[PDB]
Amino acid sequence: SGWTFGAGPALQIPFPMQMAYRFNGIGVTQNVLYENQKLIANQFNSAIG
């Protein structure tokens, strides 16, 4: 659900779409994530391990 469930009723949302609007919250356009979705997931999977 993202940040919405902390402000009201939880709303379903794709995780790759949630991350695209979290990149939008730091100063990088959403096109960065989708062009490197597989690489970023590998980075996140390796970092969390």
């Binding site: 794709p14 790759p16 989708y34 062009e35 979705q37």
Partner: peptide, 23 residues
């Protein structure tokens, strides 16, 4: 390259306005 992209069309607001006056 984008995963999940779907097919659609975007309405250009210039070409119908640009062509109607000349034609």
């Amino acid at each position: 390259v984008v995963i999940g992209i779907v097919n659609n069309t975007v309405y250009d607001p210039l070409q119908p306005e640009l062509d109607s006056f000349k034609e």
